Amino acid sequence: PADIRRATEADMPAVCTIVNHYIETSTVNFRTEPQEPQEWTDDLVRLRERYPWLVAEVDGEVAGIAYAGPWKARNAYDWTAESTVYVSPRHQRTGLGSTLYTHLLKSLEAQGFKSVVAVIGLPNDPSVRMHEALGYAPRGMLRAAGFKHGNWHDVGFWQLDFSLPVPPRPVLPV
Amino acid sequence: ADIRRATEADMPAVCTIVNHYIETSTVNFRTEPQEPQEWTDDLVRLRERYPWLVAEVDGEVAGIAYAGPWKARNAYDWTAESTVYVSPRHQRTGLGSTLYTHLLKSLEAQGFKSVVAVIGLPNDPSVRMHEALGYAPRGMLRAAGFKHGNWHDVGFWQLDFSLPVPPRPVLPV
Numbered sequence: 311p312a313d314i315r316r317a318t319e320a321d322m323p324a325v326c327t328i329v330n331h332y333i334e335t336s337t338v339n340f341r342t343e344p345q346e347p348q349e350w351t352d353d354l355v356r357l358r359e360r361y362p363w364l365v366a367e368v369d370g371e372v373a374g375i376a377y378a379g380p381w382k383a384r385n386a387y388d389w390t391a392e393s394t395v396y397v398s399p400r401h402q403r404t405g406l407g408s409t410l411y412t413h414l415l416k417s418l419e420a421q422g423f424k425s426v427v428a429v430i431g432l433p434n435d436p437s438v439r440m441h442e443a444l445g446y447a448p449r450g451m452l453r454a455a456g457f458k459h460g461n462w463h464d465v466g467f468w469q470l471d472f473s474l475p476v477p478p479r480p481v482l483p484v
Numbered sequence: 485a486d487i488r489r490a491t492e493a494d495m496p497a498v499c500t501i502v503n504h505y506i507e508t509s510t511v512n513f514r515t516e517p518q519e520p521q522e523w524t525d526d527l528v529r530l531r532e533r534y535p536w537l538v539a540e541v542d543g544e545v546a547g548i549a550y551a552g553p554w555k556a557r558n559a560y561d562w563t564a565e566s567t568v569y570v571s572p573r574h575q576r577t578g579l580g581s582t583l584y585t586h587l588l589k590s591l592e593a594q595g596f597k598s599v600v601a602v603i604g605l606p607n608d609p610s611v612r613m614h615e616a617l618g619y620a621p622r623g624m625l626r627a628a629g630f631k632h633g634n635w636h637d638v639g640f641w642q643l644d645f646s647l648p649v650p651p652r653p654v655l656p657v
């Protein structure tokens with residue numbers, strides 16, 4: 311059993327620990343410096359009313375995070391969100407990522423977003439397969455765009471499209 | 485015509501050119517006019533590590549091509565973004581491609597790995613110019629922007645260089 315719920319400030323140290331592990335050990339993101347919980351909490355409090363920030367809690371512990379934010383700082387992009395998801399290494403492939411994203415995506419759809427973009431450093435078969443299983447389509451890839459872990463890595467963009475009319479209404483808060 | 489390094493004195497004229505396209509076109513997805521200070525700030529911050537070039541015709545700024553960081557992670561340090569705008573008075577007289585030729589020669593010699601151009605679509609003139617200079621289409625987000633009454637796709641084009649593994653730091657201009 312798992313509670314997918316809105317993330318709180320108290321969850322952020324655990325989230326920071328999870329994501330830092332992947333920063334250190336994975337090329338799925340191209341960060342090469344760990345983050346501090348303060349940055350996570352600052353971002354949460356700044357964005358959580360506009361974008362869904364969700365955690366999966368299992369047996370009282372934070373086991374995963376999924377969150378959205380703006381894609382690019384232009385008004386024209388207001389209906390385009392970025393999504394991110396990390397599940398604790400002890401909790402992989404138990405459906406948490408899917409559940410987190412289903413809740414995330416349903417929120418963004420109801421809020422009136424046009425689409426959601428996922429940036430995936432490659433190769434990362436689990437993330438690619440999970441994103442495609444949830445309806446994201448591969449939209450292209452920049453070759454050898456990042457140097458991390460001693461090699462050049464491609465970065466791919468996946469996108470899940472919603473239907474909106476012309477013109478779109480301003481998006482709703484969470 | 486002159487192809488030379490961009491200076492702070494050029495920035496109001498550049499800002500005026502790009503603001504015209506912001507106002508009248510969807511070739512970029514900004515909706516609000518920019519102030520020249522935004523241009524000056526980026527020029528001052530970037531001009532030592534990235535080429536910023538202006539075309540000058542009959543003594544007036546006629547276009548700009550400039551590069552900057554693709555993304556603010558150190559892993560992207562060898563990946564540049566390129567951008568080019570020519571005044572509507574000076575379109576299709578070789579300035580854009582000449583500017584880019586110089587820009588690209590610099591980025592290659594400085595030791596970048598690749599250059600990425602972001603093209604709000606449709607923009608046949610820009611796609612044609614980029615592909616003629618060796619950029620390859622690398623993908624496209626659908627309906628990523630809403631501007632001037634319609635959804636617009638945005639495409640990414642990339643020109644690849646080659647570097648050893650590991651790369652050395654990029655050289656300054």
Ligand SMILES: CC(=O)SCCNC(=O)CCNC(=O)[C@H](O)C(C)(C)COP(=O)(O)OP(=O)(O)OC[C@H]1O[C@@H](n2cnc3c(N)ncnc32)[C@H](O)[C@@H]1OP(=O)(O)O
Nearest residue numbers: 338394395397402403404405406407408428436437439440
């Ligand atoms: C956020 C971005 O845009 S990129 C960063 C993605 N995050 C990471 O790479 C961190 C490390 N990995 C993870 O956190 C997780 O593996 C995630 C988030 C990629 C996937 O979440 P999980 O909870 O493990 O996946 P979940 O159990 O919901 O599986 C959903 C579907 O995704 C696919 N899938 C998931 N994991 C794998 C895997 N190792 N190999 C192949 N397919 C997989 C499968 O289709 C799976 O369905 P199935 O189990 O019925 O066969």
Ligand SMILES: CC(=O)SCCNC(=O)CCNC(=O)[C@H](O)C(C)(C)COP(=O)(O)OP(=O)(O)OC[C@H]1O[C@@H](n2cnc3c(N)ncnc32)[C@H](O)[C@@H]1OP(=O)(O)O
Nearest residue numbers: 511567568569570575576577578579580581601609610613
């Ligand atoms: C910056 C980015 O990554 S996207 C934003 C690009 N900037 C803009 O769209 C602003 C408005 N347009 C412009 O400033 C210019 O038209 C640019 C920058 C796209 C091209 O610069 P120009 O100086 O006009 O191009 P230039 O004269 O060097 O022509 C080079 C090639 O580009 C193509 N091209 C340029 N203009 C056109 C046009 N109207 N129609 C079709 N093809 C064109 C052609 O292949 C041309 O080669 P050719 O003349 O031998 O047939």
